[PDB]
Amino acid sequence: SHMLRPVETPTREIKKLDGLWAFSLDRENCGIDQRWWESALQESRAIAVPGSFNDQFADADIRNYAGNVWYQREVFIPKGWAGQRIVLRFDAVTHYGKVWVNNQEVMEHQGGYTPFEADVTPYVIAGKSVRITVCVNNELNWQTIPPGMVITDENGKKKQSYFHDFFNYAGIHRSVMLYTTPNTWVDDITVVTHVAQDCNHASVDWQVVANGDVSVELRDADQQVVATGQGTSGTLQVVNPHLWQPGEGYLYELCVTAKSQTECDIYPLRVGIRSVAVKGEQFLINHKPFYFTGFGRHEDADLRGKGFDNVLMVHDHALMDWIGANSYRTSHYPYAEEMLDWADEHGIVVIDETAAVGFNLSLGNKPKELYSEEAVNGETQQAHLQAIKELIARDKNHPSVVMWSIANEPDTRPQGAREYFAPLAEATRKLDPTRPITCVNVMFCDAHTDTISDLFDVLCLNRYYGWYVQSGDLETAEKVLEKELLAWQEKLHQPIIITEYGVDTLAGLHSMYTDMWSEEYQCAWLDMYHRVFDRVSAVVGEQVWNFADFATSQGILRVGGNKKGIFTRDRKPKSAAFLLQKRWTGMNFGEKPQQGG
Amino acid sequence: SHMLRPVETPTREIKKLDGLWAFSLDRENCGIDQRWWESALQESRAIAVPGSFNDQFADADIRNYAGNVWYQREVFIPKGWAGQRIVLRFDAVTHYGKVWVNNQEVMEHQGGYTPFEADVTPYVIAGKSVRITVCVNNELNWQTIPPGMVITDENGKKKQSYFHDFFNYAGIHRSVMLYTTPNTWVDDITVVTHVAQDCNHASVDWQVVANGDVSVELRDADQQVVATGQGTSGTLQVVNPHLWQPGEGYLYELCVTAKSQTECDIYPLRVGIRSVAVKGEQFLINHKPFYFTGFGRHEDADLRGKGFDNVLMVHDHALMDWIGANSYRTSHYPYAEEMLDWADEHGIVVIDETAAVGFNLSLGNKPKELYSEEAVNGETQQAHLQAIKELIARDKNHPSVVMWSIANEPDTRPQGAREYFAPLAEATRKLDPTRPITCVNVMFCDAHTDTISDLFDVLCLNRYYGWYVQSGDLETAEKVLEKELLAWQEKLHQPIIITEYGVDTLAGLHSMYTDMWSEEYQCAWLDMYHRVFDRVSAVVGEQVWNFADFATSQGILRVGGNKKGIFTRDRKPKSAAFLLQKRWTGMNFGEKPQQG
Description:
The structure is cut from a larger assembly and holds two copies of chain A. The first copy, chain A, is of the alpha+beta class. Chain A contains nine helices and 29 strands. In chain A, helix 4 packs parallel to helix 5 and helix 7 (474-492) runs parallel beside helix 8. Chain B: Homotetramer.
């Protein structure tokens, strides 16, 4: 549906994410039958929100738990809020969430990484305190995004199984708020910014105002007006100077007011004026070839799981800024909007990515046909499209987002793969014509076996695990890698971005033999990649797999949540960090190095 | 200035620790002269609050910065607040902050761990947005609490020098919030809990609010009214057997109303029925012998500095609950209020300490006399008093605080140490007679050398560095320790708490020789301490020195913030953790082990 970011502009909200809530594990799955949303959570404990619930209690059984959990908290509504259209919103409840304000069900949602909101005006009163109960579910199946298989042992004890790398953290990972708008105008905007030769150009506007006449005002960083538009929707105004550039990200403000006969609603929307477009093998930002550098990240840290935190965010950006990263990719799920906001203001280019990982049973009682009624089916497809919808509906206006990534590492060999993704690709294009589309490719689906990449605009290649198959031989790895890249170039003639490349590296482990798992190896490995990159013209970006060590699912090729990061989980740097700092900062900003110079 | 912890009712507040403010350094120190509060911070960057500024940017030059820093943020004041009174509160700004709303200077404060709030109604329009600017200072001097010295080298670069262990993290470490009160009540309240015997005793009410006739209703955990009084103050109530105990921590609620023809207001406070008494050699919470187990902690974490964090607090308590700790001490400064509330709600007892460390020049260009005018003059003693003042002003009602601490590891050797502290010991008792009092004792200032302990109710001893003075010998240390313990006992016949004991221990270091810095050694060390404890009837409390590794001042002795914890900075357990777990959960709750 319509998705705007709650901001304060004679519009108001009251953070509810003071994180101290009542928490309970519904081991027996009685909570719903016994209407737990009606009375206080029995035998509950204090938990923090935003935050995963898995690691807050240093308890393995809570961490590995699967099924239903219950969040509960009481809150006063601002009295001033009398007849003001009150809506309760959850920025993200990971996987499933159902909400009751005092015995009244108002909400249900399936995605773990996108916001949902409901009008609660008629269930609440200006001066009163209400009970808010949330039922959260962390179970994945073939119709969820991302997919999974719960395994129920003989004892009926649930056990989540999934096909992606990162740990399946759950809970309210993000801000939950209560906000206010005039009864006149609610919930949607859409913007498009065109550019010619960096001489002037226009900004296509269009939005719904929920029964109000809208006027539009484009304002400067100086807060001065530069263009006007009454056109309720379909406003088009030409501008004369300041483009949104990766280095700086100059931002304009679009003021959308909605005039009723009596009520007024004002919404400020930040605008970056830039064109994103593929031309041949180049990826153009304002008609300039751009070269990506940066990371595949992960919403992950020490006690908070995937819970959002302002400190982490400021620190990690200071690292990326130091290291010379000009970009990153929201690896395997949509990030907190505050992340994209930051990017917008600082000119960080982003590859916005759905939660669609684990469409692959070929990465080590599993179904033999990946695309089958039993496994990834029409309903799954429908869930996927829905995931694509809500992400786009949330992020279509961020200048930082230069590209949509529909899925990560699907197995595209089997029959049914192209039957599954062709419709998806088409849909996302119609949903947003402004941005190039992509689907991150697995290694074993190489140029000669892959059956989907032609349906997309830019080639994103995950080449992590080149050290697995090449058994840690650099000489061999460099020859094979250069072979495959050129093959991909001749096949698609698209821009190529390496979206994953790196090696598990144990911090502190040093070796004179420069062998696997040593800081020295991570350097040699990365360096071998960079050398071939500078030799291949179609390569327009390089994103190291993992900014920082994150927790992973249980396994043998797994070392304490694994060590794929350039930085540790506590954000300390391994040797490779300085190697990258040197390559990225010695580089002309956003310019691809000539054949290694 | 009265102190009331804000809470929602027909009373409201809006947290503005929305976490990102504009931020700038003032190296050139042009801030005030150039009237920086007037307009948007130039050349600024994003910062998060609550949190320290030091570690948010992975930059040494910012990390070790001394002088003024600038915080700035805009905020909409809710439109339903018009006729009501609007006030701006800071839970803590570490060291010094002054505030400008738009161009109106509303605030000034010294003491980095206490709240300060001002009525800003005249300078605020309900409908509008106001620019908040804060000038934060991290500099310490001798009149500062904790003391320090800044060296502005001939180059004109300022360098902060101080005398305590932990790093001098600064910034806005805790929540900042606007809040609403009607015109009928302003800041003050007080409560006491006499409990004479097994069944029921009384709760002396007290209250101070301008423009208000007071109701003062009491309440159960079930919201049933079990007692009432009418008097604006001096109220009192007698109840039945429902004791706040360290095991569960049963709480009550006291609803309080102040009333006018125009406006009315009910403030809700929580009450724990407990008595804190020292009977000879024993410490008492409700006429019974208690034995403290826990840690000396710190407000420290990766990235954030001393900034508050819920995930952090929920996790640490999980660990403390698991480990079997029933108590702890806000070591070397006042903790976040949330901590006390948690302790109150869970039944955790808290030795509450003030920011008064560094009063010692022994542990290592400095003044030759500790208590000279050059160092800790009378002007300092007032600042001290001020700091002890304000702590009690915000913690006197918290059931979990069973004891006050006026300072940590002061040097009592120099002539005229008692002249400085005797007044403060006595003066603070007049600020609260409800709770006993203690001063934490440095090691070298033993019974014979130290001249101040007599003015305190229970003895708090820091035996950390028992490994350093004994050059790592366990056989020797144990003898010296026990002998030194009994000397303290018969001198003052006092309840003795060991407030610090442990040894530098590098996680992941193992050794067959069980030598220093090895996880094995730590265990061996802690064990020999426990035995002597078991054999001394005077010891009513033990608290391992440091729950977790914390960042210290730039130190040669320091090794990665020196690794003094049972847990690592990222909360991973050392071997010792499993030892303290086994001992602490292997004994009756709050009960000292039999003669070992």
